[model samples]
Target: MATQAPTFTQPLQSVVVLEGSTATFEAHISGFPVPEVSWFRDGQVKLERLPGVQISFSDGRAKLTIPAVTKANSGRYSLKATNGSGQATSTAELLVKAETAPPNFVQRLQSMTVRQGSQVRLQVRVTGIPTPVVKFYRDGAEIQSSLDFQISQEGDLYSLLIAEAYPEDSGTYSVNATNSVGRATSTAELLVQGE
Candidate 1:
């Protein structure tokens, strides 16, 4: 029988610097016999009682998942591999950076006026990075697209023109901006009063 050599997947370097939003870490291992995997932080076993960290293993691959990542969860991680014949150990460092503030978002109502019988038109403007997705809500319920409720988007600004405004259309309207980094939201109030 020939002796098999244990090898680490390309980047022997396991140390990683991640942002607070990072949710998962993946590592690959190859050898004759499956390797035993273990993780530790500050010389103490981790992911055992931690609510945010999740560990899973299959074949020779391992992955660590973290939910609701935070800045405090950063430190050294060690992995130990052992077979009936021998054992090997490896260490990796993890650094978690502070979370950045979400983009500044602003929502403004340009104009509001009643048109033909009980009908009202409201113009709104929004500004933000990565553009914002605007949605109109009435009494906390989302208003679906319809002929009466017209929505148009130009550049990074959006407008909502209500053909026939009803008492049900009066409420707080909010615009939300989302990207790979984070999410931001802005709100404006729309009040429809009888003429």
Candidate 2:
């Protein structure tokens, strides 16, 4: 009576979900004597033992569900069906996008004045879902931490320090913050007085 080999009527399809959201994979297969369905990740790890997953099969349809998916859940998923007649497998990819926020300046750096040879500080505060990379620039050229300069961050606060101020250090200074989503910048003028 078992004459037909296992075959997929609806093969597995890829899925995409945002971080902290649910994701599901579905398929339909036909075979003689009703086949048994099993799920695997990357063709190696069995999904049945995984936590926060729901797997079911009924009416020639197979379903796999994942709740609150994160980047770790993104991978290739495989489904295998077997019966007295034969076996068949299908595979698809899953993608999970991070829920991200762009950079924003809550407190912009302000202009200031300091005497030559004195220490100077330029600071600001920023906010973003993921911490952004902050960089400093003076008169349009990027600056880095050195014996004469120090760039640092503390929580949401970022600062650039001039160890010994000079007339040449006086210029339009800017701080740029960037992340996966967007970028933000704040600018202020520095005036160094000479003796």
* Best lDDT among the predictions, by candidate number: 2
TM-score of each: 0.50, 0.52
Off by over 4 Å in 2: 1-97
Task: Per model, state how many residue pairs clash.
Answer: 0, 0
Off by over 4 Å in 1: 1-5, 10-22, 84-86, 105-195
RMSD score of candidate 1 (Å)? 8.1
Q: What lDDT score belongs to each candidate, Candidate 1 first?
A: 0.60, 0.90
Query: Which residue pairs show collisions in model 1?
Result: none
Cα lDDT of model 2 overall?
Answer: 0.90
Q: Write model 2 residue lDDT over 1-195, tens digit each, in one string.
A: 647888999998887777777899999999988888999998889999889999999989999999989899999999999987789999999999875888899989899998989998889898876668888999999997886798888999988989999999999999998988899999999999998
C-alpha displacement of 67 in model 2, angstroms? 18
